[PDB]
Design an enzyme around this catalytic site. Structure first.
Site, PDB file in Angstrom:
ATOM      1  N   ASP A   1      -5.094  -8.788  -0.855  1.00  0.00           N
ATOM      2  CA  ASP A   1      -5.461  -7.541  -0.134  1.00  0.00           C
ATOM      3  C   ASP A   1      -4.171  -6.759   0.139  1.00  0.00           C
ATOM      4  O   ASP A   1      -3.684  -6.790   1.289  1.00  0.00           O
ATOM      5  CB  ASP A   1      -6.251  -7.886   1.133  1.00  0.00           C
TER       6      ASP A   1
ATOM      7  N   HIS B   1     -12.180   0.509  -0.234  1.00  0.00           N
ATOM      8  CA  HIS B   1     -11.105  -0.518  -0.180  1.00  0.00           C
ATOM      9  C   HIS B   1     -11.174  -1.428  -1.413  1.00  0.00           C
ATOM     10  O   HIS B   1     -12.272  -1.937  -1.721  1.00  0.00           O
ATOM     11  CB  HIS B   1     -11.198  -1.324   1.124  1.00  0.00           C
TER      12      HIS B   1
ATOM     13  N   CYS C   1      -5.937   2.736  -5.822  1.00  0.00           N
ATOM     14  CA  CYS C   1      -7.276   2.155  -6.104  1.00  0.00           C
ATOM     15  C   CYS C   1      -7.110   0.731  -6.674  1.00  0.00           C
ATOM     16  O   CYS C   1      -6.640  -0.154  -5.930  1.00  0.00           O
ATOM     17  CB  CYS C   1      -8.061   3.081  -7.033  1.00  0.00           C
TER      18      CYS C   1
ATOM     19  N   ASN D   1       0.882  -1.197   0.000  1.00  0.00           N
ATOM     20  CA  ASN D   1       0.000   0.000   0.000  1.00  0.00           C
ATOM     21  C   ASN D   1       0.909   1.234   0.000  1.00  0.00           C
ATOM     22  O   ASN D   1       1.650   1.416   0.979  1.00  0.00           O
ATOM     23  CB  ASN D   1      -0.964  -0.022   1.190  1.00  0.00           C
TER      24      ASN D   1
END
EC number: 3.4.19.12
Length: 337
Positions: free
Chosen positions: A272, A255, A16, A11
């Site tokens: 994720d 998310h 996005c 991250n």
């Protein structure tokens, strides 16, 4: 990594859909191998999108730690706070695949992008009261499917190939025949081995971009023969669900996550960012239908007849020893600070 055999992506801002798309492309093994074979030896590291994707793919294949993408975002110049928020996933996919398609010219993997992703459709206008028809062949690398007021993928494809009427003030300029009442539509001629379907949940009165969170069903196995102008008995258009790109939230923010069964065997993982975990088929598919804000906005299908070739095994020897040395150098130079 140790649970699953697959590593995540860092991250590093509001990128996005990016990390989701990168895993999706990485696990298009035939694309991955072709990407490794691109002649980037003489490329500038700061500017080369081709080299930048080789790096991410190499790191995703080898790294035990979450993989960084700063050099990649730098390479296609989406570096501002909201750069990814101003674009959609198909726009990003086009940038990456165009850059990679160019570098493959004059190589053993030239035309890998068209072979994998490119399909043919015919856009027609047929006059009702005069004998005139205009047929133009169009190439597509992706399909934007309308989901608003549609229950499932079948109804979307029915809506996509539905005939539009050109009547009243909206008459078609038929040249010599003047303004004429006509029918306008599209038909599918070919569906590609790797089918990229965007679900139009995110759309533009009120001057606002909105997210539709309505229930929309997509199946594990998708038959599309009935949407082809002419079907092949040897090669039916039966498609296998490979990837489910998921957004949790509303239009303004949320998310992003991707569900993949990388081998096409029905063994699903959730990706994720830095966290990759095994999940149930139900979590990957049915739980991302939405209705009564966690739902699918993009689906990847692979044609059943092309599954084993598209998902052909990748070994460490598939990365040119030159390329391996250049990234081995980069990692050593950065480990000196």
């Amino acid at each position: 990594k140790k649970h699953t055999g697959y590593v995540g992506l860092k991250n590093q801002g509001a990128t996005c859909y990016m990390n989701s798309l990168l895993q999706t492309l990485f696990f298009t093994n035939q694309l991955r191998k072709a990407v490794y074979m691109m002649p980037t030896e003489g490329d500038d590291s700061s500017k080369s999108v081709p080299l930048a994707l080789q790096r991410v793919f190499y790191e995703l294949q080898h790294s035990d730690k979450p993989v960084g993408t700063k050099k990649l975002t730098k390479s296609f110049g989406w570096e501002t706070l909201d750069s990814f928020m101003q674009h959609d996933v198909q726009e990003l996919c086009r940038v990456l695949l165009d850059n990679v398609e160019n570098k493959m010219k004059g190589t053993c993997v030239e035309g890998t992008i068209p072979k994998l992703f490119r399909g043919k459709m015919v856009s027609y206008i047929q006059c009702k009261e005069v004998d005139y028809r205009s047929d133009r062949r169009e190439d597509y690398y992706d399909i934007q499917l309308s989901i608003k007021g549609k229950k499932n993928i079948f109804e979307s494809f029915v809506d996509y190939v539905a005939v539009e009427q050109l009547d009243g003030d909206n008459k078609y300029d038929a040249g010599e025949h003047g303004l004429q009442e006509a029918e306008k539509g599209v038909k599918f001629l070919t569906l590609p081995p790797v089918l990229h379907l965007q679900l139009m949940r995110f759309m533009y009165q009120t001057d606002q971009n909105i997210k539709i969170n309505d229930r929309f069903e997509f199946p594990e196995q998708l038959p599309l023969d009935e949407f082809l102008q002419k079907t092949d008995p040897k090669d039916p258009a039966n498609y296998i669900l490979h990837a489910v790109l998921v957004h949790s939230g509303d239009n303004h923010g949320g998310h992003y996550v991707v569900y993949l069964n990388p081998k096409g065997d029905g063994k699903w993982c959730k990706f994720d960012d830095d966290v990759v975990s095994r999940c149930t088929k139900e979590e990957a598919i049915e739980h991302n239908y939405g209705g009564h804000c966690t739902n699918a906005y993009m689906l990847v299908y692979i044609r059943e007849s092309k599954l084993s070739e598209v998902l052909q095994a990748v070994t460490d020897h598939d990365i040119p020893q030159q390329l391996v040395e250049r990234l081995q150098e980069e990692k050593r130079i950065e480990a000196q600070k």
